[PDB]
A = this chain, B = another copy of it.
Amino acid sequence: SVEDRVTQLERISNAHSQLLTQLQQQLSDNQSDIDSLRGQIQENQYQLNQVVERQKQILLQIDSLSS
């Protein structure tokens, strides 16, 4: 039963090896996924910045026009 118990451990060890390598691959792909999302959020923030800045100029242009 020590042999059967060692045999069971080698079996579970093999499954743990396979799963750990699968998880490593997924974790690294997800890190890459997140990089793409962060890049897009940044790009969008820059775009919102540009809109806001131009709104400030528009408001001032309206003030100039009003006189």
Contact = CB atoms under 8 A, between A and B. Distances in A.
A39 B58 CA distance: 29
Contact of A41 (B28, B44, B54): B44
Copies in the complex: 3
A25 to B, nearest CB: 10
Contact of A17 (B12, B31, B37): B12
A38 B40 CA distance: 9
22 contacts: A6-B6, A6-B9, A9-B10, A12-B17, A16-B16, A19-B20, A23-B24, A23-B27, A26-B31, A34-B37, A37-B37, A38-B40, A40-B41, A41-B44, A45-B47, A54-B59, A55-B55, A55-B58, A58-B58, A58-B59, A61-B66, A62-B62
